[PDB]
């Protein structure tokens, strides 16, 4: 017959290979597809949806697991005190593991784009105050006071009729893409830090509670992309699933 030759790649089974295979049921026609609402074509649509960010991941008891979803605010002495700090790496361990964006980025090695964080104030109608939320680009240590924290990109938030404000973490990096960062050599890919400071105070009249809570929601922007699909770091199986 036709003379051929075999090359050093035969007889192997590559799991990511895409080819043709022999059908088992000939002349089989599947069931027609009716209209179903809510079809997803790309994962970035889900990556653009906000989810709750556990900034306050201190408690671990079963009864106190619901306390990780918010962090408090209260009246201070007026010195410009610090409220909370956290990192800006969605793929790293920490607060971002509770969002859908972090879980989806856990399957991809590299990412690129801008992020978005939204804080909602859940106090009484009679409470007022102002806050400073600052983002420190990589290379700078944890700010010691508000004077050093004001030198990065920041926003000043005033409580009022609109209960939420948004902080945008812009894309500032030397490389086009970032790999997943961790302690050691791979801390070359840090994104920076986010800090929350008191601007003036938390003022409240007579007859209203002295403590309120803040909910943080996180998502991605329209330039966010990922590549080089891999497997998730955590496997949810401790033995044989019977």
């Amino acid at each position: 017959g036709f003379p051929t030759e075999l090359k050093p790649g035969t007889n192997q089974f590559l799991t990511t290979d895409d080819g043709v295979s022999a059908p088992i049921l000939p002349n089989f026609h599947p069931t027609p597809c009716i209209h179903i609402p809510g079809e997803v074509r790309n994962l970035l649509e889900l990556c653009q949806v906000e989810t709750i960010l556990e900034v306050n991941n201190v408690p671990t008891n079963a009864t106190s697991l619901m306390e990780r979803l918010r962090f408090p605010v209260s009246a201070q002495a007026g010195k410009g005190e610090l409220c909370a700090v956290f990192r800006a790496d969605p793929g790293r361990n920490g607060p971002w593991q509770s969002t859908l964006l972090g879980q989806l980025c856990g399957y991809y090695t590299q990412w690129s784009g801008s992020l978005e964080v939204t804080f909602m104030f859940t106090g009484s109608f009679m409470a007022t105050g102002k806050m400073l939320i600052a983002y420190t680009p990589p290379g700078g240590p944890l700010p010691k006071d508000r004077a050093t924290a004001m030198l990065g990109t920041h926003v000043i938030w005033d409580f009022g009729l609109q209960s939420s404000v948004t902080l945008v973490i812009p894309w500032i990096s030397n490389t086009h893409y970032r790999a997943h960062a961790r302690d050691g050599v791979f801390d070359y890919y840090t994104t920076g830090l986010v800090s929350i400071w008191y601007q003036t105070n938390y003022v409240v009249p007579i007859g209203a509670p002295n403590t309120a809570y803040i909910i943080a929601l996180a998502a991605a922007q329209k330039n966010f992309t990922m590549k080089l699909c891999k497997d998730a770091s955590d496997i949810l199986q401790t033995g044989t699933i019977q």
Binding site: F13, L14, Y107, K230
Partner: peptide
Amino acid sequence: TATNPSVFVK
């Protein structure tokens, strides 16, 4: 190997 590429060969 649900995500990572893998090869089975003799």
